[PDB]
């Protein structure tokens, strides 16, 4: 388990070393803030119909009545440029808030604890995650237990022994072909079916697909060996 | 989950067939490109939102031909090979109920691109998700799919709500009969009314209305002598025409900035809905919610996705 | 001999599941896997 | 034995320690042995 984890962290350094696209979202946000700034700058150059883009030149050619017309184009167009960029930015910001609020919830549920939500803390059953800082962002190193070598087995919902019906307390009942066992639902480790592994309800008539086997009782040979202890004190007590 | 991929030629929507208007529009410049970048942003986003909700598994699971699912009769929500498009039964009810203006927009340099995923591809991901859920329980989400007998899955679910697995098996008939009875009402409901789908219809009707309203702003004078560009250009020369055109460019450009601002904002609503739906898939469909009411009222057992026009339906199953 | 092609996207590999009314699969082994997830 | 469960042998667990583990069934039977032995002994008597 430790070796697989060490092997996986190795692959993270390798992955981040190998591809350009990994930090995609963060590199995207930076590109969008810079592109929007340069777009805002570039509207300063636009004439809007005024005889120049350069505000002093206009003063140098027109009086207070005609400069007011030409300048009011640049003010109206420019003010429309700031009202545009700030709208795009208030919207952009609203995307980032939803991202941040998820990232806060993931910090709480994937770092300060272990989530049961499926695929919420990366693909596979969650074990833990390690947070890492980035330019304007966070990276989570999610650690999961992914099933890897499955094998086919026969199963039955329940077992009949004393003509009562029996169920796993936790786990499932499975046959290797020749013998029935009980095991945990998420890793193969078969066990002898016993009273302690199981619980009982009703007779064998209602449960569809129920099968017949023994149930072993760990009290029983502890009393059988105590019956054979008892008989040996009787045979000895026949001797005197 | 998504909406129409609008695309507009801003030059088309401001300056349709005028070079005079084109030269005047260059006095403003990048506003035309900038809006197209914004609409292109939302248009590419639809393929993300639709991948995020449906493409949660990268392998195409399929049903066995035999249907020994303990009496649970999914045939109403699984695909139908007899159909010209392979959706289920319940998905045709969804497609039949949600609804010249579309040509009038087309003449004005407005366009609607098709989504990357065809509605059959959406039915195909849905088929894999649903068949996976039945044949394999949650296990196909967390790793390679492990088969399980359907009543053994249902026992796990019952234990997931702390109800004991014998309480399933001791009533398996009543449970399957109620599951079948409930899907019978899902059909009867979705066949009868259309009001339950009103969330999707209201999303279409807003997007369609915003395109109608943006179209209807072309027929506006804005205080120029005509609402029609050409009727100015026909009547006035290069001194006078420009002043009446510069008003229509201004009024129209303001009318576009407005529609795009509305649509970026609207698209933030749909993205919240996409993220919620992706989570609802990831937790109710690929899992079992311990979250209360998050997968419908009652204790969560399991949920089945069904495709819908630009959206998704979850059929949540609950113990009550 | 490389060229730009066009195709309907195959959504993945096809896989009919080994379902039966009495069949289960169980992992005898597992991988501990780590992923990155990046957030703004 | 009821608070715990059992698997494997002493080699595999890094840092496993030694102690008794109680069995509640043990003196519950052993007192039944003292009860039995008192019957055995009395049956020597007659
Ligand atoms: C299914 O699992 C069964 C339990 O692991 C297994 O049965 C066991 O088979 C071994 C031999 O492979 C037997 O080993 C014993 O054989 C005799 C018993 O008198 C002794 O000489 C040996 O020392 C050893 O104790 C087990 O007795 C037997 N267990 C049981 C409960 O019968 C099956 O072989 C497995 N089936 C398949 C298809 O592999
Ligand atoms: C699983 O094991 C059960 C115990 O062996 C077995 O039950 C037994 O089945 C037979 C046939 O149904 C019964 O046979 C008797 O039936 C009546 C009396 O009730 C007589 O008319 C017959 O001549 C015959 O004697 C056994 O009495 C019955 N015993 C019990 C406790 O069930 C199941 O049939 C087995 N099932 C499978 C699938 O193997
Ligand atoms: C926990 O209890 C264990 C069982 O008593 C105990 O294992 C025993 O430890 C001693 C000392 O390490 C070993 O002593 C013998 O070691 C070799 C033969 O194996 C000889 O060269 C020595 O002379 C000596 O006889 C026992 O063999 C060993 N028994 C077993 C079954 O492994 C652990 O040491 C105890 N651990 C703690 C921390 O209490
Ligand atoms: C899991 O089982 C399926 C089929 O179920 C078993 O198949 C028989 C061979 C036998 O074991 C029966 O008791 C079961 O019903 C396997 O599917 C087979 O796969 C091979 C290719 O590997 C193919 O040639 C066969 O036609 C398939 N048969 C069926 C019925 O699908 C599957 O491979 C098994 N998986 C593992 C990991 O063992
Ligand atoms: C599952 O439910 C469907 C719907 O009732 C059943 O299919 C119908 O079966 C009857 C009897 O053969 C026919 O009259 C209908 O035309 C069928 N409809 C469809 C859509 O196929 C199906 O038989 C049920 N399966 C089980 C195992 O009960
Ligand atoms: C639990 O409630 C169910 C109904 O939800 C009962 O099932 C019905 O029982 C009557 C007879 O009492 C039958 O006529 C119906 O046809 C049954 N319906 C179904 C769908 O099976 C059930 O009897 C109740 N059980 C208990 C123990 O109260
Ligand atoms: C479980 O899987 C791991 C690999 O993921 C197995 O470990 C390998 O075991 C073989 C020998 O069988 C060695 O050659 C490899 O070098 C091992 N790799 C590691 C990381 O140790 C492990 O043995 C498997 N367990 C079982 C029960 O099969
Ligand atoms: C399982 O399927 C077989 C056919 O392959 C059928 O004959 C049998 O009765 C079924 N058993 C159960 C418990 O469903
Ligand atoms: C038999 O019982 C006597 C006491 O009555 C005792 O001394 C002796 O050790 C016992 N022998 C065996 C083999 O149990
Ligand atoms: C615990 O740490 C000490 C060193 O401080 C070491 O000697 C001991 O063997 C360690 N035991 C385990 C189980 O790691
Ligand atoms: C013998 O044992 C019985 C109890 O079973 C007791 O009542 C009786 O007093 C005993 N007699 C002697 C002589 O020990």
Short mmCIF file of C-alpha atoms in Angstrom, two decimals, chain B residues 10 15 23 43 56 93 103 135 170 174 180 182 184 197 199 202 216 218 230 234 263 282 292 298 301 305 308-309:
data_model
loop_
_atom_site.label_atom_id
_atom_site.label_comp_id
_atom_site.label_asym_id
_atom_site.label_seq_id
_atom_site.Cartn_x
_atom_site.Cartn_y
_atom_site.Cartn_z
CA UNK B 10 -21.94 41.15 -35.19
CA UNK B 15 -24.22 46.40 -40.82
CA UNK B 23 -16.23 51.53 -42.35
CA UNK B 43 -21.18 28.04 -27.44
CA UNK B 56 -19.08 10.49 -16.46
CA UNK B 93 -42.53 11.36 -23.74
CA UNK B 103 -36.02 31.57 -40.43
CA UNK B 135 -26.27 -4.76 -13.72
CA UNK B 170 -39.13 -11.00 2.90
CA UNK B 174 -44.24 -6.20 -3.13
CA UNK B 180 -43.19 -1.32 -11.53
CA UNK B 182 -44.26 3.70 -9.73
CA UNK B 184 -46.28 3.09 -14.52
CA UNK B 197 -41.38 19.84 -17.73
CA UNK B 199 -38.40 24.26 -16.21
CA UNK B 202 -39.09 28.22 -19.66
CA UNK B 216 -37.29 43.16 -33.18
CA UNK B 218 -33.67 45.95 -36.01
CA UNK B 230 -30.52 50.70 -47.04
CA UNK B 234 -30.56 55.17 -50.92
CA UNK B 263 -26.92 35.74 -22.41
CA UNK B 282 -22.31 11.55 -9.67
CA UNK B 292 -31.24 13.92 2.98
CA UNK B 298 -37.86 9.62 1.26
CA UNK B 301 -32.25 3.73 -2.69
CA UNK B 305 -31.23 9.09 -15.67
CA UNK B 308 -34.41 15.38 -22.24
CA UNK B 309 -34.08 18.31 -24.72
#
